Amino acid sequence: ADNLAEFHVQNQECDSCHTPDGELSNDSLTYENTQCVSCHGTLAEVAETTKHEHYNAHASAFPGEVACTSCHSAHEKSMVYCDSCHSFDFNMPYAKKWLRDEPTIAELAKDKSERQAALASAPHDTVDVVVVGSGGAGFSAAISATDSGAKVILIEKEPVIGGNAKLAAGGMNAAWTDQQKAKKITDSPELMFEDTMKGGQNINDPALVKVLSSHSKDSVDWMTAMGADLTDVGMMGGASVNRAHRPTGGAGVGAHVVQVLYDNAVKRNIDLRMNTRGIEVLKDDKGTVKGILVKGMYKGYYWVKADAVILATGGFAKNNERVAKLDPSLKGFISTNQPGAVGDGLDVAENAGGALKDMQYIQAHPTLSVKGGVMVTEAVRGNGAILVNREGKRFVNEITTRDKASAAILAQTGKSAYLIFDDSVRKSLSKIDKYIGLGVAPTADSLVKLGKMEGIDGKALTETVARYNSLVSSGKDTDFERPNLPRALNEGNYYAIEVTPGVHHTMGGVMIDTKAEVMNAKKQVIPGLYGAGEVTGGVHGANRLGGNAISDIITFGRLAGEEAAKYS
Ligand SMILES: Cc1cc2nc3c(=O)[nH]c(=O)nc-3n(C[C@@H](O)[C@@H](O)[C@@H](O)COP(=O)(O)OP(=O)(O)OC[C@H]3O[C@@H](n4cnc5c(N)ncnc54)[C@H](O)[C@@H]3O)c2cc1C
Ligand code: HEM
Ligand code: HEM
Ligand code: HEM
Numbered sequence: 327a328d329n330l331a332e333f334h335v336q337n338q339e340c341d342s343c344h345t346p347d348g349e350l351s352n353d354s355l356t357y358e359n360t361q362c363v364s365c366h367g368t369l370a371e372v373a374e375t376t377k378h379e380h381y382n383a384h385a386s387a388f389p390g391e392v393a394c395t396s397c398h399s400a401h402e403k404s405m406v407y408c409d410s411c412h413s414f415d416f417n418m419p420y421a422k423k424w425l426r427d428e429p430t431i432a433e434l435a436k437d438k439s440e441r442q443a444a445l446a447s448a449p450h451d452t453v454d455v456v457v458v459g460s461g462g463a464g465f466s467a468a469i470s471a472t473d474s475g476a477k478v479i480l481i482e483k484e485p486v487i488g489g490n491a492k493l494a495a496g497g498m499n500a501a502w503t504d505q506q507k508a509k510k511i512t513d514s515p516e517l518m519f520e521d522t523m524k525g526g527q528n529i530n531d532p533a534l535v536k537v538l539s540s541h542s543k544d545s546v547d548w549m550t551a552m553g554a555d556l557t558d559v560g561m562m563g564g565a566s567v568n569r570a571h572r573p574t575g576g577a578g579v580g581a582h583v584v585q586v587l588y589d590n591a592v593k594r595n596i597d598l599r600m601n602t603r604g605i606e607v608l609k610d611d612k613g614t615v616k617g618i619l620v621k622g623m624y625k626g627y628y629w630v631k632a633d634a635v636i637l638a639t640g641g642f643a644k645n646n647e648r649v650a651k652l653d654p655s656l657k658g659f660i661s662t663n664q665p666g667a668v669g670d671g672l673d674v675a676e677n678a679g680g681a682l683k684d685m686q687y688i689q690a691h692p693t694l695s696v697k698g699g700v701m702v703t704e705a706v707r708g709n710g711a712i713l714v715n716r717e718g719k720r721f722v723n724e725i726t727t728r729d730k731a732s733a734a735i736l737a738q739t740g741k742s743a744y745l746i747f748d749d750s751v752r753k754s755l756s757k758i759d760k761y762i763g764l765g766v767a768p769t770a771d772s773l774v775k776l777g778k779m780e781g782i783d784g785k786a787l788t789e790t791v792a793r794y795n796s797l798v799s800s801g802k803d804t805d806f807e808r809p810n811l812p813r814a815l816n817e818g819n820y821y822a823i824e825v826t827p828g829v830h831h832t833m834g835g836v837m838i839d840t841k842a843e844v845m846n847a848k849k850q851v852i853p854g855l856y857g858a859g860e861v862t863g864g865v866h867g868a869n870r871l872g873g874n875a876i877s878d879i880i881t882f883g884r885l886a887g888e889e890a891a892k893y894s
């Protein structure tokens with residue numbers, strides 16, 4: 327058989343998968359996936375028949391209900407969604423090699439005749455608010471506009487929810503929380519503001535940082551009121567005190583928060599459509615939003631009539647060509663992002679008249695696993711790990727800013743470095759057991775053997791750790807002046823992870839005011855158009871602090887949702 331449908335029609339009718347009139351139920355393929363599930367079992371039942379020791383196509387930490395048609399198309403060969411970041415050994419029937427080629431919003435100009443036909447038809451739905459993107463900002467806004475009495479449609483162009491927010495590990499920054507107080511942490515919104523400005527080089531828009539800092543406690547209480555666990559409070563670089571909140575025992579912040587938001591959306595019956603891309607914000611004759619034209623991967627173009635459009639489409643860090651244009655130094659770097667984080671929501675914003683700002687500031691995360699090509703949380707260094715070069719020495723304050731840490735790493739022999747830590751750090755941060763499970767953290771009971779394994783000078787490494795621990799115990803890092811030295815590296819076994827920088831976050835984007843209203847180049851509000859999260863510029867300045875993006879998405883998403891509901 328050349329495809330999965332042809333295979334199944336050797337013993338089945340067309341309607342063992344399709345509805346009675348045979349039309350596609352919707353762009354989520356609800357009815358159709360349900361048929362796959364009714365013969366093959368749910369996603370968990372199917373994982374039992376495809377186990378591998380260290381991985382499984384049908385089991386992943388992705389939140390939400392992952393549709394079988396996310397990877398299995400019926401009438402054509404398709405691609406495994408895990409291959410946009412890993413290379414596991416899979417043998418999916420009717421597979422084809424992972425290759426994302428999504429047209430730009432500009433190349434979508436060519437569909438002049440379908441667009442026109444769709445815009446001359448009646449709107450397909452008429453609601454109060456349309457939310458574009460199912461990352462943190464997008465679900466938060468959908469929920470808060472709904473809890474504000476507005477009817478919402480939430481759309482996601484990918485087949486799965488969560489964007490890059492489902493990958494967050496380190497934590498969500500917040501200050502002066504009840505979680506921090508119970509952890510005997512002393513902080514204030516003023517220290518977080520101050521760490522943020524300093525952190526972004528005083529380029530950040532101060533009114534936005536003030537919203538960021540002043541609403542962060544509330545953003546954490548909101549999430550916690552909806553069911554999240556954000557009681558573990560750790561440190562990341564450029565913070566004065568520990569203020570990165572995440573689940574108990576240091577598990578990832580991302581997948582958990584996106585799972586809480588999805589559950590909350592679901593309880594409210596929020597209309598969520600997958601495989602549905604926002605293409606053009608529609609405006610009336612007085613330049614205010616009247617709706618949006620969308621492109622359903624399965625049922626074509628159609629428009630949603632609405633008073634308000636919230637753009638929560640995240641960044642363009644996956645887009646190395648745009649990234650290279652703005653920063654030539656990042657050309658050819660690997661990236662930590664999901665495959666559709668390419669900037670198309672920015673094009674929608676501009677075409678709508680929104681102006682952009684800070685676009686030249688692109689953050690490279692300092693520690694991507696060379697072996698796995700995936701981000702290794704900075705909470706690994708925050709909970710105590712050190713960085714050593716191939717000569718087995720420390721070479722940088724490990725909890726310095728991302729810019730500095732990336733530069734020191736690229737300057738080392740081989741252009742990479744090694745995270746080094748023990749079982750006390752491991753046990754303090756459960757996330758580390760994910761990297762051990764990926765095969766990216768070799769271990770040994772002595773630094774002498776660990777260094778032999780990885781090409782690190784063994785005796786040098788042993789004396790480096792011994793010096794570090796003595797620096798921990800005396801309380802001052804007089805070598806590199808790391809300001810927080812939480813743990814001696816002396817328990818149980820040792821572990822090394824080889825790390826190198828990757829494109830990670832774009833601090834510039836659509837220009838928003840304090841109510842998340844998109845403005846033009848004159849700084850005039852575009853009525854009905856809002857912007858929230860990494861698609862916006864001005865929050866993070868020239869350099870974002872680890873932990874500040876999940877705080878930003880919850881805060882600015884919530885608020886845009888509320889403001890869009892009021893506006894109407
Ligand atoms: C690997 C990794 C670890 C990180 N760790 C942390 C952490 O620990 N703490 C922290 O503070 N930050 C962290 N960050 C940053 C990060 O989580 C965020 O910057 C990011 O998720 C912002 O969320 P968002 O909702 O704004 O966008 P996203 O979560 O990226 O969601 C955007 C969504 O919009 C959809 N979309 C885009 N364009 C369109 C369109 N035209 N139509 C319909 N849908 C569209 C995208 O497909 C996507 O699902 C981490 C980032 C990553 C990638
Ligand atoms: C799009 C929807 C579905 C998906 C993604 C899916 C998935 C799959 C895949 C990946 C295969 C392997 C084919 C090969 O080996 O070449 C398969 C085979 C099979 N499917 Fe489906 N399926 C779907 C719908 C259904 C339905 C509706 C039925 C029954 C009416 C069904 C019953 C079977 C059977 C009997 C086989 C052969 C082996 C077996 O499972 O006993 N499938 N399916
Ligand atoms: C001869 C039998 C069948 C006929 C005539 C048929 C017809 C179609 C048509 C016409 C479309 C495209 C519609 C559009 O673009 O609006 C389609 C898509 C689809 N069909 Fe079928 N179908 C048949 C069998 C099946 C079977 C057996 C399955 C599942 C195993 C299936 C699952 C799907 C899915 C999931 C889609 C969406 C696109 C895709 O994955 O290719 N179909 N079908
Ligand atoms: C309930 C939803 C799904 C069903 C019913 C389904 C069905 C199946 C079946 C029946 C097989 C072959 C089983 C066998 O040969 O024993 C298979 C293989 C596979 N499917 Fe799925 N699938 C689903 C969802 C997904 C998703 C969401 C992904 C990707 C993220 C995926 C990726 C794969 C891969 C990679 C293989 C080959 C497995 C390997 O080599 O380990 N499937 N699927």
Ligand code: HEM
Nearest residue numbers: 380381382383385386407408411663664700701760763764
């Ligand atoms: C169904 C699809 C996928 C599967 C089955 C899968 C499987 C895994 C596995 C087995 C691990 C090691 C952790 C563990 O032992 O559970 C892992 C780690 C990781 N994968 Fe995936 N992966 C998938 C898709 C993706 C995609 C698309 C990305 C990025 C967009 C991604 C990013 C990561 C990250 C960042 C980690 C590191 C550990 C963590 O951050 O929790 N994965 N994945």
Ligand SMILES: O=C(O)/C=C/C(=O)O
Nearest residue numbers: 495496703704872873
């Ligand atoms: O967990 C991390 O390394 C990243 C956090 C961030 O980008 O804020």
Ligand code: NA
Nearest residue numbers: 833834860862
């Ligand atoms: Na941005």
